[PDB]
Amino acid sequence: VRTIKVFTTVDNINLHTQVVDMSMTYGQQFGPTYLDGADVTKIKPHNSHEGKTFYVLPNDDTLRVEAFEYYHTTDPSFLGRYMSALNHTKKWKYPQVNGLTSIKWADNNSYLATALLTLQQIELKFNPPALQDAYYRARAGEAANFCALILAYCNKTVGELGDVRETMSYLFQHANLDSCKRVLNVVCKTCGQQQTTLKGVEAVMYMGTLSYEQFKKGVTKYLVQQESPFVMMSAPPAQYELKHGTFTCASEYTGNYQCGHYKHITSKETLYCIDGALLTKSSEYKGPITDVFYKENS
Amino acid sequence: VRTIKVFTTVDNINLHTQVVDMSMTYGQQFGPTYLDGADVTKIKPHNSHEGKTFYVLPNDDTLRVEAFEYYHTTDPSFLGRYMSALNHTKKWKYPQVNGLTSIKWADNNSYLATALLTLQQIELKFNPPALQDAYYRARAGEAANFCALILAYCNKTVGELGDVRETMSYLFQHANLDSCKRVLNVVCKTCGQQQTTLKGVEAVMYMGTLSYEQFKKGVTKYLVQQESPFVMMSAPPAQYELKHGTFTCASEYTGNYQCGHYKHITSKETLYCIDGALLTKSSEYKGPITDVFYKENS
Ligand SMILES: COc1ccc2cc(C(=O)[C@@H]3CCCN([C@H]4CC[C@@H](O)CC4)C3)ccc2c1
Numbered sequence A, B: 001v002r003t004i005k006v007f008t009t010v011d012n013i014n015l016h017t018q019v020v021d022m023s024m025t026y027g028q029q030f031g032p033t034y035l036d037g038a039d040v041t042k043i044k045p046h047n048s049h050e051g052k053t054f055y056v057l058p059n060d061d062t063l064r065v066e067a068f069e070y071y072h073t074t075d076p077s078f079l080g081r082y083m084s085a086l087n088h089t090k091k092w093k094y095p096q097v098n099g100l101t102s103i104k105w106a107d108n109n110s111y112l113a114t115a116l117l118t119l120q121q122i123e124l125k126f127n128p129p130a131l132q133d134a135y136y137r138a139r140a141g142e143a144a145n146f147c148a149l150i151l152a153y154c155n156k157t158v159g160e161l162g163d164v165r166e167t168m169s170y171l172f173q174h175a176n177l178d179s180c181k182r183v184l185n186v187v188c189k190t191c192g193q194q195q196t197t198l199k200g201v202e203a204v205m206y207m208g209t210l211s212y213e214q215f216k217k218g219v220t221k222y223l224v225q226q227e228s229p230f231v232m233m234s235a236p237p238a239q240y241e242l243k244h245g246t247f248t249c250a251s252e253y254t255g256n257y258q259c260g261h262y263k264h265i266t267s268k269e270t271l272y273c274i275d276g277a278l279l280t281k282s283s284e285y286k287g288p289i290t291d292v293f294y295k296e297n298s
């Protein structure tokens, strides 16, 4: 009986040594098996597979615990959807653009490139170790796992159209925003003291206007106390002037012929428009903006 | 050496038999130890303690795993805060009022009674087993643990003033609302098709008005497609007429002397105003309403 040693894993942190019978498929021995995202369930071992790490589905208590502790989800379909995405995202290109990891355009991924760029400019602490680890790898230039995890957590497949605001919201809901707070106080003559507090993810998002100065003025009448590391403001795409120095970064969305495309604008010493692998610098920017992000440097 | 057998646990699901030396405190043998919420760290075992279950802090891998799988949090202070709350909430009274578990007023708990009543009228699937288990016990009449867990998860202590909308929002963020959706479509002449989708917890909450008829008929102008088992609408407390049959339940908030009080109104065959252990039935209701809940029967 000819054999090789491989490692199995659900988290790529805890590796489990296995002896594989080379006359049987990976599926016959482990169940559904993946090598760097590729489904090798129906493949018989190759000699080249010696010592390599394979993902398997958590089919026992030990692996179930390891997966829950790493991904913070009990969804049994998660690993398969993550591997399916990773088989694609590992083939994308991740150029450094203006100091930031971006994504060369492929598979309708402009929304993911724009989200990835934004995530590198705001301070976020992810709760699942899987996102924290892959996020730091992405900041360092290797973003394939992060992008595939974003897709899996958001229940989106490679090639499916996506929305930056939605993606950021769902990621914020997997982050520690416990200290973030927005207090609304009613301005009235006879109603007394009326106050409500948004804590956590609700405090870092607002829909209806792009302008933080407009939001800060209130919208019946409210005084706003905003306390968070950042805020995401969103509105329907409309022509909007981004003035250098008045924001951190922003999402542009064009919808010509109902085929939409995102670009990312960031405010450094001047305005930079990052469009996947492309970079364009300008002093002023007017375009159909739909998200603006603001940062409190503290 | 005289001893007794007790069970230790972090989840009250997995019980671990221990032999206790009656000459040492529970703290010397287990660390921080609790009996039905009571801190017995400094108490020596009693003969009456034989065969009883004590909570301990998760101080080894086995207990850490059991606690994370049951509570879905890594906060080391959680168990201690849960036990402190439970030592109080176990002493509260939980009368059945019109088929619903309420709470007799104590320790400024009107917001918790109002939340508990609301939670029994909307269908919610909690992610942490600790909340799902305690919710079904609460529905059956034994709500002390559910109330203590709510306090622990919301980082509130017994006696601290609280907000129903906030409490419901934080609980919604621990529930499976993945299928919930609110689609907003812009009403315009020249802007084309503009649509954004709120998925999950954002879809089940709205702030600014109490009326669902107003919210749906415009919200510049938007067409709303609402798809969720329930929706919570909130606004500053204001005099508001609750019409029988047009809502499921509602939160009234009076602000007397800046120490406020909640009541719960539910629409059954007539209007029921549940004020802890107190009940008043009426055909009409006008009061300072701040939350209204609507349900999608299917
Ligand atoms: C009341 O406040 C807001 C806020 C944002 C709004 C956005 C829009 C949009 O039209 C966004 C623009 C970005 C791209 N998405 C698409 C990406 C592809 C696919 O995922 C469908 C959605 C559409 C409309 C109204 C908004 C209202």
Ligand SMILES: COc1ccc2cc(C(=O)[C@@H]3CCCN([C@H]4CC[C@@H](O)CC4)C3)ccc2c1
Pocket: A184, A186, A193, A194, A195, A196, B161, B162, B163, B164, B165, B207, B208, B209, B234, B235, B236, B237, B253, B260, B290
């Ligand atoms: C823009 O949309 C909304 C929505 C809700 C609002 C509520 C209020 C209130 O005044 C709520 C009323 C309920 C009780 N809380 C208190 C409970 C005790 C303690 O937790 C402090 C808060 C205050 C004000 C404005 C609102 C605006």
